[model samples]
Target chain A: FLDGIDKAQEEHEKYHSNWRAMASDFNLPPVVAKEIVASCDKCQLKG
Target chain B: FLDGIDKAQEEHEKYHSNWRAMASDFNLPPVVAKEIVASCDKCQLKG
Candidate 1:
């Protein structure tokens, strides 16, 4: 993932993690979304 | 999800609700997204 600040020694590790978390939000499946949502509505009704 | 040729992928993810100093949007909670937009206009607002 592209870190927020491009540095020589990777200063902002946490910042990069945040970026990955952001990337996952878009990359992950709807069912696997980070938080509960309308998608869960379907799963909820299932089980 | 079919991760594809999205150039604006990073900027595209919208995580409004769970506002953090730098980690939000695509990182936000949905219910929180609403208040996020309403709160301070943007959640990423930080010191």
Candidate 2:
């Protein structure tokens, strides 16, 4: 899950501002991805 | 964070299927609430 979040963060930096898009990339539900991204201080900071 | 998750699960059973509502209840962002719900085996099973 944390791994997914890490990858999501990387993707967040690279291409999309949308967590739903990142969720699709990681094969996670958008809700789950949104949580991971939001909980992550780094991802929140980046966003 | 974990405390918020526990409350979310309880809320999940009692009232809402929507994490966003629980998030509001807990003063958490919907995204963070979603992750906590999704990551929890209990929450997912209950959901």
Top candidate on DockQ is 2
| Candidate 2 lDDT over residue span B1-47, tens digit each | 55666767677777545777777888776665677655554554452
- The chain A TM-scores for the candidates, taken one by one, are 0.21, 0.58
Off by over 4 Å in 2: A36-47, B1-9, B12-47
Candidate 1 Cα errors over 4 Å, as ranges = A1-32, A36-39, B1-30, B33-47
- DockQ, all models: 0.05, 0.23
TM-score of 2: 0.41
> Chain B alone: TM-score in each candidate?
0.22, 0.57
Structure candidate 1, residue pairs in collision: B15-B25, B15-B26, B17-B32, B17-B33, B18-B29
CAPRI class of candidate 2? incorrect
The TM-score measured for candidate 1 stands at 0.17
Looking at model 2, what is the TM-score of chain A? Answer: 0.58
Tens-digit lDDT string for candidate 1 (B1-47): 12321211333344322324213534433333322222332333332
Taken over the whole model, the C-alpha lDDT of each candidate is: 0.30, 0.64
